[PDB]
Amino acid sequence: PRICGVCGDRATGFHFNAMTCEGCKGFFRRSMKRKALFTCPFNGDCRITKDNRRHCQACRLKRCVDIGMMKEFILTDEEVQRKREMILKRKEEE
Amino acid sequence: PRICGVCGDRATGFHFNAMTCEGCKGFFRRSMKRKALFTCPFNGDCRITKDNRRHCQACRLKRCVDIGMMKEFILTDEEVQRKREMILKRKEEEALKDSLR
DNA sequence: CACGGGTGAATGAGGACA
DNA sequence: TGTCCTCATTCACCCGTG
Ligand SMILES: [Zn+2]
Ligand SMILES: [Zn+2]
Ligand SMILES: [Zn+2]
Ligand SMILES: [Zn+2]
Questions:
Q1: Domains of chain A in sequence order
Q2: Family assignment (chain B)?
Q3: What's the rounded Cα separation, in Å, for the pair A71 and A58?
Q4: Which nucleotide is nearest to A28 (CA to C1')?
Q5: Cα–Cα distances in Å, from B55 out to A91, B20, B40?
């Protein structure tokens, strides 16, 4: 069922363990990495939609966490780097 | 669709949630940031335009809100600070990230 | 194919200044 | 007051492993 569980936009698949759109995967990863602190400028129960997500980050992010996206599935820097060190330890194995 | 919805001028994009001209963006943020209460020198029904614009702060501000602008999107003095700082911390982390090259 | 990361052009928030 | 500039975020797309 290809609809993003966060904002309702068209979903491209599972991301960090949940059916999401490209925008929410991106939003969610970046938010978790930069350990961002967000606050609702309203009531902290915003209804996220494809056209408002950009605005309440707090709620959008609490929403990713509630549908089950998992920060754990985001590679770490050390992890990315070891990878690059194989994507060129392989393009040098080839 | 372009075209400021408050003044009729050419808009630069959405500001605090409504398509507006650079000037109304400015006007709207200052106003709300002061709590500024205005009172109209005429009849509370001023037709606003790219011209008479700066004349009735009361009506312009009231028109802003009907068009859909939101004081909630104007950043708070606390938020702004956390930004100038969040600018610097990532700044010293790009520095340290450099050294260990 | 599915899903990690990454990139870059567009968005829009604030601010100096005439 | 209103430019016009800076700079962080956003997301459509694309690359590469599994
Ligand atoms: Zn989404
Ligand atoms: Zn909210
Ligand atoms: Zn305007
Ligand atoms: Zn008036």
A1: 1-94 (3.30.50.10)
A2: Belongs to the nuclear hormone receptor family. NR1 subfamily.
A3: 16
A4: D10
A5: 67, 18, 9
